Design a protein around this ligand. Structure first.
Ligand code: SF4
Ligand code: SF4
Ligand code: SF4
Ligand code: NI
Lengths: 628, 708
């Protein structure tokens, strides 16, 4: 089968074959037929009595592990641990952001750039703002956010966009969230040998844990990032590997933590570093981003996006990356080995993400700007080691428009508001187009790439099908970057791919049919948007014609995201089967019984066209339930 | 029931009503009975626009129900909803067409029913000149009569053309709203299907002014959305049929406003409960802008009152006419001779009358000053003075110069109107309409008989003589710069006028001097200078710079234009020509008909049918649209032989242009009162009879060279 639908990706794969280096596709081929027990989730290694593998087919073979655990128990515990790991990644990101907020000052490297957003957040956290210094408010807000992570007494703080009905449903179900780290610890405790051996209770614990990601960790990370670095607005950028410059220093920012990439962007305008780039024979400094850190700097500053997850290696294969600076998460360790075949300096910066044989330059949060400057200086000085005979940059780049935060979306919707009617600054125009049926619904396309799927194929096919069916699409993460590379993040795309209702809406509001809402933590924005719509219509989020899709997901973070999206009341389609087919009870819970609990459920569909059809049918069913 | 299901349900009900009424027509009249709308050239406009087919008999009307059926696809997507709205519009037209089949006069007063083509062309100019900011389609019923009257009169006072469907017609009558075509308050009918009669106005505007052929539905829908500033105000409870008809208005790009709770669609379907803000909401929703007029008079001053009628029973006093001679004059003077804001009245005031409608001489002397004010701008100001005086409620002004006629009604007098308010209105409108040149304006109203007698012969008569002399002294050879008016491009993108001294604008409201004054007042206005250089042929009227200007202004739609010919590259017309001239190859001449004429012609076509052959900005040889002042011109069909080609004219038009036509035809040495040779509908109308009359009368056309 084809490795990708992206032509630049294919050219660089040919180059990597010529250069004798191996990619993620080559390692996937080397893995051959993957273990059936692990693929079905019926393998357990939770204690040293094991490893235990039970039959994925009930009634045949070994039925129980040594401790007596059934296939359903093993599957449910494995699924819960995936959710806990994803929640941990997102919560650690949000915790770093909250600590950065706590260390803001007027004359420091980290300031408050959006005071209005900070005051609204302070209102949401019961922090007084009138007649107060802005940094005192910021510190109080950071304290409340940090308490959300580890409070042992009392209730956590949740955003006002979350409907009261959803909160009450969670409380009745027993999944109402506690402090984030406490829920992660609870999930890890209940999967220990000889604890929870009941699939339904295990799934409920995992949902409870995922809620602390969706509504607390990711939400606080996003809102505090907006406070410190600015709320995203409509902004132009370029996408795909063609953004690399042969005649300039190329600095590629890969990872998830935004403070480092923000400081690198600021350092790139330093006169001394620009002069140094000129002195090593380069035209200038060309910052490019990849994955979620690329999404953040692109949403807030228009930094060009070099590529998504499965392109990271190919970025090095060009031979033009002088410095690849990585913080945490979704950083293929093979990059270190790959960097030996080129001049590239592979720089790790976080104590959480040491990588063997990479150059470690710890990013100092006490002096973020100076630390970013020294890291960037190492990348710039590496330009002298460039071998221009090994350089091949495909001439394939695509224009994209992004920056669609909830605030930006509301500002855009204000155009189609009659002044004599109003109100202004609400999601009411979006609610109106959804209720009238001009738009059939809204769908979030999120997730990673996965060698099991032709890279970016499922993302593009799902998005095109949805917008052709007058479903407005919001995108995050690597799916958003696939849309950017393909050319869907363009106003012109409205008349090229969208159906009649969505084309009319795009023309009236002057937006692309596909709205890039940011990184994987920025999925919280999607929640926020949906919540607002629900609160405007006086219904729960499970009554709306909305859906989420993860066509090509790979990470534990994706599992946690899908779990909290379903738990919030939004049906979720997974384009890659999770390792649960071995447990019939777990499959039945996730795809059938979940609808009785939270009004939504998982859909597993590896065919994107069938997924689009199912999404449209489900949205029409919910519309008929709602009367619209 | 959601929005899509409500629209689909309404369209099916519209289809059900259309099928039932068509069955009655078949059973009573048969499938061979003729189907037509009174005085139209596009058969059933909605069906002609959508399919290009003209429906003439009842049998074809029954076959038009398949058009309605094919437009109702019950799939919840926006395109199907708009098509379903168009299905209701087609069904409503079929119902209205069957009404004229069953009953000779389906509509009685005050309802007007179908709107004829000449009416649409009459209001075509007001639309382009902005005189009419938009079309307010009001249907349903308001909570009370006063609420409806307030909203309707608010639209009327802003110059909009408002059309009424349903019980708002009765509510407005209870609210004492003055209705009429000239009052811009048109009641269409009490049934919902009567709203199609204003829809066909927008549809035929695309056919007439846009020059879009029938069957080009998307181009017509695009035209009405961009060019026609119509909107719908739906008051009272809305049935499914009303909602489906509204989807038809949305399909034409017309936003629908209502006081009912509906599934709102931004910029298209909006709810506004506050009746005090409905007018402002609609103007914003349709992007309509109205300039605010401030006037210190205790009477309503709106353009829609130009057509007001005052009965002799309730008339306070009349001036002018044959009772007591009255005059009006606008003269330019030095800066010190006129001081700003000096409204003096000489003689008795209007309140001193103590009797029945009284006779009193009148005189309006207007003195304007400015650095750029010359003697040639006075005719424009004096011509707009008539419109300024006719916009006041209770005041009717008829005529010009010393042959004028002014009447004041008792309704205006009871509100405090006096003779100084004439000066107030004139001053405000002169400083507003002509603020570029009129820096100061001293207006004096004269009612003393002696003062009126002595000032009329001292200031007015010599200026009338000099204006007549200047008008007679203007020919195309004397001047060295023409003018081009592209005002009508707001509805006819490919149409450009070239006003010459001997050929004015086909609308009749723009002349060479008017174009020269508009260029001076508004250098960025529609009128721009066109030098007459690069002459190609003086006989046919060709200049190289004129062709270059027409290509530039029309964006290459028209490359070559001839000004003095009807058969070789004639100048395009849009929809507003006062008269239209068409060749008659059997009589070796041309026939002519004005818009007011509503009878047949020797060509076998009425004015509407003839005019549907040369409009929209398309070069159509053999048919020319022109004003009445171009009939008796030495450059009228100069290439084809001149005035000798006129073989048939309406009697009213012949009486209107008789003196000028005889004077101009005296150049052909036909000293015979040439207007007598030309046939008219009172002498003969068929080709055989008119040709016999020409042969007996020795018409010059028969002795000339062949015209084709
Ligand atoms: S999933 Fe379990 S059985 Fe399969 S290879 Fe891994 S440890 Fe062995
Ligand atoms: S927890 Fe039970 S099933 Fe899992 S490895 Fe230990 S004994 Fe085997
Ligand atoms: S001169 Fe021509 S463009 Fe101007 S108003 Fe008259 S017809 Fe229209
Ligand atoms: Ni015209």
């Amino acid at each position: 089968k084809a490795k990708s639908i992206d032509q630049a990706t294919l050219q660089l794969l040919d180059k990597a074959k010529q250069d004798g280096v191996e990619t993620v596709w080559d390692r996937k081929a080397d893995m051959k037929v993957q273990c059936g027990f692990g693929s079905a989730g019926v393998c357990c290694r939770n204690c040293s009595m094991g490893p235990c593998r039970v039959s994925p087919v009930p009634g045949k073979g070994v039925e129980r592990g040594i401790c007596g655990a059934t296939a359903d128990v093993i599957v449910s515990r494995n699924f819960a641990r995936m959710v806990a790991a994803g929640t941990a990644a997102h919560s650690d990101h949000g915790r770093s952001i909250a600590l950065s907020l706590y260390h803001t000052s007027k004359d420091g490297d980290i300031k408050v750039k959006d005071e209005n957003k900070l005051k609204e957040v302070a209102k949401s956290f019961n922090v007084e703002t009138e007649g107060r210094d802005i940094y005192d408010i910021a510190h109080d807000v950071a304290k409340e956010g940090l308490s959300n992570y580890g409070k042992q007494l009392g209730e956590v703080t949740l955003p006002p966009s979350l409907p009261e009905k959803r909160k009450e449903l969670w409380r009745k179900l027993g999944v109402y969230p506690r402090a984030v780290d406490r829920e992660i610890a609870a999930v890890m405790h209940s999967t220990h040998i000889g604890c929870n051996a009941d699939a339904e209770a295990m799934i409920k614990m995992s949902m409870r844990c995922s809620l602390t990601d969706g509504w607390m960790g990711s939400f606080m990370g996003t809102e505090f990032s907006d406070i410190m670095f600015g709320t995203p607005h409509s902004i132009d950028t370029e996408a795909n590997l063609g953004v690399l410059e042969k005649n300039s220093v190329n600095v590629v920012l890969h990872g998830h933590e935004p403070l480092l990439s923000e400081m690198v962007v600021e350092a790139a305008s330093d006169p001394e570093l620009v002069e140094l780039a000129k002195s090593v024979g380069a035209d200038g400094i060309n910052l490019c981003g990849m994955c979620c850190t690329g999404n953040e700097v692109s949403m807030r500053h228009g930094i060009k996006i070099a590529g998504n997850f499965m392109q990271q290696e190919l970025a090095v294969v060009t031979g033009a990356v002088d410095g690849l600076i990585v913080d945490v998460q979704c950083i293929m360790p093979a990059l270190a080995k790959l960097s030996k075949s080129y001049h590239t300096k592979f720089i790790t910066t976080s104590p959480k993400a040491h990588i063997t044989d990479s150059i470690y330059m710890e990013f100092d949060e006490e002096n973020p700007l100076d630390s970013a400057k020294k890291i960037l200086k190492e990348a710039i000085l590496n330009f002298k080691n460039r071998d221009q005979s090994k350089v091949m940059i495909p001439e394939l780049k695509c224009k994209a428009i992004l920056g669609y935060s909830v605030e930006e979306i509301i500002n855009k919707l204000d155009k189609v508001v009659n002044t004599q009617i109003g109100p202004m600054q609400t999601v009411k125009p979006l609610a109106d187009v959804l209720v009238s049926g001009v738009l059939r619904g809204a769908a979030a396309v999120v997730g990673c790439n996965n060698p099991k799927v032709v890279q970016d194929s499922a993302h593009i096919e799902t998005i095109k099908g949805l917008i052709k069916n007058d479903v407005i699409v919001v995108v995050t993460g690597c799916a958003a970057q696939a849309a950017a590379k393909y050319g869907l993040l363009q106003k012109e795309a409205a008349e090229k791919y969208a159906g009649p209702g969505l084309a009319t809406v795009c023309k009236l509001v002057d937006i692309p049919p596909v709205l890039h809402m940011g990184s994987c933590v920025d999925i919280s924005r999607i929640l926020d948007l949906v919540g607002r719509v629900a609160n405007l219509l006086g219904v729960d989020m499970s009554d709306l014609p909305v859906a989420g899709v993860a066509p090509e997901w790979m990470s534990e973070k994706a599992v946690a995201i899908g779990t909290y999206v379903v738990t919030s009341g939004i049906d979720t389609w997974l384009g890659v089967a999770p390792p649960v087919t071995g447990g019939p009870e777990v499959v039945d819970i996730l795809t059938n019984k979940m609808e009785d609990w939270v009004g939504a459920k998982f859909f597993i569909e590896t065919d994107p066209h069938k997924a689009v059809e199912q999404i449209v049918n489900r949205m029409n069913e919910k519309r008929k339930k709602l009367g619209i | 029931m959601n929005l899509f299901q409500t629209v689909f349900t309404g369209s099916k009900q519209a289809l059900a009503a259309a099928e039932g009424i068509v069955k009655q027509a078949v059973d009573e009249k048969g499938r061979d009975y003729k189907v037509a709308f009174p005085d139209t050239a596009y058969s059933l406009p909605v069906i002609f626009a959508a399919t290009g087919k003209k429906i003439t008999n009842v049998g074809e009307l029954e076959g038009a129900l398949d058009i309605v059926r094919s437009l109702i696809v019950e799939e919840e997507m926006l395109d199907k909803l708009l098509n379903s709205g168009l299905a209701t519009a087609v069904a409503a037209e079929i119902i209205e067409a069957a009404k004229y089949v069953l009953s000779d006069a389906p509509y009685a007063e005050p309802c007007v029913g179908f709107i004829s083509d000449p009416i649409i062309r009459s209001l075509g100019v007001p639309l382009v000149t902005g005189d009419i900011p938009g079309v307010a389609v009001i249907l349903g019923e308001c909570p009370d009569s006063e609420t409806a009257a307030k909203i309707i009169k608010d639209y009327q006072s802003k110059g909009l053309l408002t059309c009424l469907v349903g019980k708002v017609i009765d509510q407005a009558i209870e609210g004492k709203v003055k209705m009429g075509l000239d009052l811009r308050v048109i009641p269409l009918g009490y049934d919902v299907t009567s709203v199609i009669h204003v829809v066909t106005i927008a549809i035929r505007a695309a056919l007439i002014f846009g020059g879009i052929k029938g069957g080009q539905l998307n181009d017509i829908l695009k035209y009405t959305a961009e060019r026609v500033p119509a909107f719908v105000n739906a008051f009272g409870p809305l049935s499914e049929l009303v909602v489906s008809a509204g989807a038809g208005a949305i399909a034409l790009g017309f936003p629908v406003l209502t006081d009912q709770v509906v599934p709102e669609v931004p910029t298209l379907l909006l709810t506004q409960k506050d009746y005090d803000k409905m007018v402002k909401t609609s103007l914003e929703a349709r992007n309509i802008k109205i300039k605010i007029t401030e006037i210190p008079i205790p009477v309503s001053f709106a353009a829609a009152f130009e057509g007001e009628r005052i009965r002799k029973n309730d008339m306070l006093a009349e001036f002018g006419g044959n009772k007591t001679k009255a005059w009006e004059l606008v003269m330019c003077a030095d800066q010190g001779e006129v001081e700003d804001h000096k409204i003096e009245v000489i003689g008795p005031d209007i309140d001193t009358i103590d009797k029945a409608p009284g006779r009193m001489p009148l005189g309006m002397l207007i003195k304007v000053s400015g650095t750029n004010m010359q003697k040639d701008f006075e005719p424009v100001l004096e011509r707009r003075l008539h419109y300024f005086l006719n916009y006041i409620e209770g005041v009717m002004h008829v005529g010009q110069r010393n042959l004028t006629w002014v009447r004041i009604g008792k309704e205006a007098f009871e509100k405090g109107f006096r003779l100084k308010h004439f000066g107030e209105v004139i001053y405000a409108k002169m400083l507003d309409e002509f603020g570029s040149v009129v820096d100061k304006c001293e207006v004096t109203i004269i009612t003393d008989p002696g003062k009126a007698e002595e000032l009329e012969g001292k200031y007015a008569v010599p200026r009338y003589k000099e204006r007549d002399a200047r008008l007679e002294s203007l020919v195309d050879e004397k001047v060295d710069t023409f003018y081009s008016c592209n005002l009508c491009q707001s509805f006819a993108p490919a149409h450009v006028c070239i006003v010459t001294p001997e050929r004015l604008g086909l609308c009749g409201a723009v002349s060479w001097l008017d174009a020269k004054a508009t260029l001076e007042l508004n250098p960025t206005g529609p009128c721009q200078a066109v030098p007459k250089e690069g002459v190609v042929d003086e006989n046919l009227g060709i200049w190289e710079k004129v062709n270059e200007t027409v290509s530039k202004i029309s964006q290459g739609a028209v490359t070559s234009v001839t000004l003095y010919s009807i058969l070789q590259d004639p100048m395009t017309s849009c929809g507003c020509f006062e008269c239209i001239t068409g060749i008659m190859p059997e009589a070796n001449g041309v026939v002519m008909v004005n818009r007011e004429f509503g009878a047949t012609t020797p060509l076998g076509m009425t004015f509407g049918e003839l005019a549907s052959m040369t409009g929209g900005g398309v070069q159509t040889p053999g048919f020319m649209g022109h004003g009445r002042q171009f009939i008796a011109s030495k450059k009228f069909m100069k290439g084809e032989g001149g005035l000798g080609r006129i073989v048939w004219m309406p009697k009213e038009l012949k009486d209107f242009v008789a003196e000028k036509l005889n004077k101009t035809a005296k150049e052909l040495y036909n000293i015979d009162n040439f207007a007598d040779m030309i046939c008219d509908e009172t002498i003969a109308t068929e080709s055989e009879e008119v040709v016999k009359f020409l042969e007996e009368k020795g018409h010059p056309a028969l002795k000339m060279d062949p015209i084709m």
